[PDB]
Design a protein around this ligand. Sequence first.
Ligand code: CL
Ligand code: CL
Ligand code: CL
Ligand code: CL
Ligand code: CL
Lengths: 274, 270, 278, 273, 278
Amino acid sequence: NLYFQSMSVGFIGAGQLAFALAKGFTAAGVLAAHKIMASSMDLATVSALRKMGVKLTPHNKETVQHSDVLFLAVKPHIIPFILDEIGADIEDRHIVVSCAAGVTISSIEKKLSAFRPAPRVIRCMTNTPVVVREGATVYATGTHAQVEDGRLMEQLLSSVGFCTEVEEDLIDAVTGLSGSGPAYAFTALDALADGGVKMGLPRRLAVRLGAQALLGAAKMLLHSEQHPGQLKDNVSSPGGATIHALHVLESGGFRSLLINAVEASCIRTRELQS
Amino acid sequence: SMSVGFIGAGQLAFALAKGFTAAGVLAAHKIMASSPDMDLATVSALRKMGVKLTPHNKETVQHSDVLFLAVKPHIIPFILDEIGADIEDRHIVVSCAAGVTISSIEKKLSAFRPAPRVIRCMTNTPVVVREGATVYATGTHAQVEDGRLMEQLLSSVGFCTEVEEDLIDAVTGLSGSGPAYAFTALDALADGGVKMGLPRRLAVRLGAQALLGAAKMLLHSEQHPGQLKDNVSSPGGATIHALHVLESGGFRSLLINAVEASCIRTRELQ
Amino acid sequence: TENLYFQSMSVGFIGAGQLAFALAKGFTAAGVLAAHKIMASSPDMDLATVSALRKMGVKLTPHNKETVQHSDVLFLAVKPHIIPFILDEIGADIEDRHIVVSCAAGVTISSIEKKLSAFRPAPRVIRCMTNTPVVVREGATVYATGTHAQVEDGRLMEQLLSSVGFCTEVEEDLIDAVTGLSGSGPAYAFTALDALADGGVKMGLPRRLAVRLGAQALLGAAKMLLHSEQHPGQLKDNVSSPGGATIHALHVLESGGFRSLLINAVEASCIRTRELQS
Amino acid sequence: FQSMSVGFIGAGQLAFALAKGFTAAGVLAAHKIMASSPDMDLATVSALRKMGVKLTPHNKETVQHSDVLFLAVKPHIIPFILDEIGADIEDRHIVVSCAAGVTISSIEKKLSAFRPAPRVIRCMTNTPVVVREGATVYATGTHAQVEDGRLMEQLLSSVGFCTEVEEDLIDAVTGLSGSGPAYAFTALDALADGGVKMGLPRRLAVRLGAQALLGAAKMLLHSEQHPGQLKDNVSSPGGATIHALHVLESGGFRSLLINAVEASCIRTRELQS
Amino acid sequence: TENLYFQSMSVGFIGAGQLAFALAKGFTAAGVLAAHKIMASSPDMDLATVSALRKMGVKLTPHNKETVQHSDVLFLAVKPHIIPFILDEIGADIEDRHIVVSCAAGVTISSIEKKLSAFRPAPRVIRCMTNTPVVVREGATVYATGTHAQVEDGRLMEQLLSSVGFCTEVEEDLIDAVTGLSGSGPAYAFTALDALADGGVKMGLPRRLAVRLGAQALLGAAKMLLHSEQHPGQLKDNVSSPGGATIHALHVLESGGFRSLLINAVEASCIRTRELQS
Ligand SMILES: [Cl-]
Ligand SMILES: [Cl-]
Ligand SMILES: [Cl-]
Ligand SMILES: [Cl-]
Ligand SMILES: [Cl-]
């Protein structure tokens, strides 16, 4: 029955992330949709937000004056433009939460400190499954963030999934793992379904079964105290179908591809910083 | 009022007994399990839960109303010969064995009594957290009420739907073997997290959460998985770079290979 | 045809190669321009493309200056390394009325404006990236407007180029990526159609039928996607029946990394375009 | 011709695509089409329903409704269908099998048990009939009249390219234009991913890639040139395109498409067996 | 030209496709036959190859029987699966004088003699494997003589076919392998020349020049080897200077298994020919 009585939230950016978080927060019951405002405007996401009850506006300054907690849900290269546009509208009360991949706390604070000293900044990396309250979020607190700010951020983002504080220099690696992770899974689920269809399953059933399989396996591991290799061993019977299929995954270097992916996403994130 | 029996007391019977009791569909002590090996760790875990154990398959048959066969495919004909004479009118015999056809079971049971009620099912271990993926097919003598009971039971521990029996070998290669594909994926994702500087514990937690959230997102969405992939991939961004490296390794083809190989091996077992 | 006609517009082409013939043929076929309001100039007035233009009734000249004096809208349809020589040649002949439309891959608006501003301030420059299928009115074109382009200039250029295909304005820093996708795209398709026909022939079809069927398949699929609200993967799903022929063939494409090769190609063309840009 | 009624045994994606195309071409009214399926819970059945197509669970009703009867079920179901409604075939019927792999001979053999001289046509078409740009071939059976072939060609030409072929080409056509649109949808998704990787919005990338393919295909159809000559025509020396063509060649791109046509054709021959 | 002239020889072609035009064009160019002593027949008397034959002055007819009655040497220039239908059609029209020269890939002398012997004993049959470059008098041909071929028949056929290229007698059981090497060889070369030209274009050559240079290189190298007493690897050594451009490029061919692909191709064509033979 958590509810943030005094909190007004703003989103600068009204895209996939802003929609997902607002949907997750209101689904959780921690915020009413009308205490949320977003800015952008003929966008698909912006049409959905209006249905939820989220206030909307084409003016980033209005989002800023509305908001206590202010999410910057824009692309990495737009962040500097945003900070210069509303930097003079930042007030003591604002917590500026940057969601942009790769953009450092140091740089946001540099840009905002030209307007007022000690802006309160948090960097976060979340993902779209917050829209079903199963996101994966990490955050790091900035130089002038108050101790209550990180706790407030964690209580809010925990309502829509996993959330934990990390040192900032981990966030690029988290981006390559849980930020890009859902995309890896959507690709895997499409391919698994193609597999089921090749072997004679109707597409709709193959998609449902593959997604249920992944969901159940992920929950099993989250609820288990066991190594994922131990769960693999437990479900593989001698001579059986599963160990045969695991061999063909191994023969294509399946494991190395996923390592390559996490690495490539992390490295590109570091390039976006620079 | 219904009582459940397991012939076989391995990972599947544990997982199903744990899920059924967790769902509250029946009490641990209304379940009975028999195994040739009373020293397996799954048997000791069943004991802890409060499930009744016996070495005698006949005891399980006479205890049970719904009787699951959770033994290895090549054991099924020996089990059917052992307790065929003890099947009664009331029994619904649910074979969980990969590859084994309703026809072959009905033929062996029919030697002892006409009209055995047989259901064939393919499920997976995540029933242990009530998120299994189950399909079933009803046999010649299975009443319509039998399929409904079966679906209501297996829905308490995850997704459950009736299929034509000729789909079950392919289901085996997708959701039967699927969790093992995911556990492999999760170990490798965590290795990638660790390579890039994350502590192992956090990397495992984030990868598992990413997969759980993605799967739930897809189940709750009306969108194609490629559309979701498109929605979360920004231009020039980190995710589309990493998807390119998956593509360059033929990632999709490996998962197709896996489903095919597990399905083909399942067909070899019958 | 297109229910447009630019009655007061003289169009000039510097360069009389494949692209100039493709655009002139598309414009005249669309009815938006009469071939005699078009003039083209070429250093090789013997190219096969020059013979066809003459047949169409396009005016031809060996003198780039004569094309400039004739035209209002001036298409620079030359190779990227030649744009600087052309601008030095006719830069003093640009007048207030001229809209200079550079078609050269990679050449930035910045660089054209810099070379032209040596002769006259405020040249009106547009950068476009189009492709040869404008010759059958199914081109794909993007454009970006320069510093001194008037608002009406980009609107006029979009009207003209939409008569021969898809056309939209983009930020200039997207054009290198577009070059890699729709600029080089037809060549990817011609390679694919040749290979698909070889496959049809291997399995016993006459070559003519195989080329016809393969091209019709690609045309129909592309039209289906354009007219659909669906994701290409949904359409892929919709047409792959369980256990069937199509899903078996899709598996062999996946085993070869088919998707990754197409991503590689867009990337390689885009990166090469950026190298020409420097 | 004005009284012609069409039936589909099968209410899947092909039945929908053909019904959509036929009615878009104004060939006949949606209510002059009847489709049957064992599963009425299909989305394509919902699509057909909203179109105005009459729907039934009874193949016999579809047979009695129709004059031109399309068989648009999976290859392994055809023999059960033929046994089920073979006694309901009448002299007016033209039976058009769309099933992959299934031979005219085998259809005539099953139907001949019920009535001499069944009029059978085999065709291979594809989903783009839904936008009237299908690729269709057909072969006429033993008892098909010359009029039947002409009617067949007029009907399937209203929704795209259509030509008569020897039956022994149809398996290969299946691997080329039957499966072709799926190869293109895969290619278009990948091309879009490449455009997005290089900084384009997804929506624009899909649009540009589809337009590129549509235009290239139309150019080739309208050209008297070899596709390799058109490739040469648009490949400038040292340029972006020839660099990208090299990376396609380095991956064996051409051989993958050959492999795909071959694999689809071979599978089609297995479905027959 | 060739200082031969078969003044009493009437030649017939059943089939009027690429191979019939290639041979007729080579024979008449060599001067060994006048186009009017040649007759060709085709089921499609509208093929482009039929238009050219008519231009040459070759007699044309839709009736295979009329070609048979006209000719002394009778070339069967049809697809392997059609040879049996042709032999059933004209078998009763074969006379003592006829030499039946089958060009079809894979079809054995045995099978032709069996089908023809149903009508007349002792048909004179020759099996040959040639290629399209006979059209420029640089074909590569082998032949094997049948059971009832007279000694003079194989000598006559070698005289005729040597006027348009290399020609030699082989045991019939070598012809499938020859098909894989010189029968399919020109197609390997056309593929190689297209790829080499693409390479020249990538590195900045105009396409026309690149095709010209690549073809001249291949022609010159093949002529060097034919006129040399040396092993091709010795010639490779002789032209690769230490540390130089050529040896660097040879390394990248080796890294791709270039040699193994060419071996694979000969093998695949030979094995396919054997499958057609069955
Ligand atoms: Cl995401
Ligand atoms: Cl499992
Ligand atoms: Cl082009
Ligand atoms: Cl299709
Ligand atoms: Cl040849």
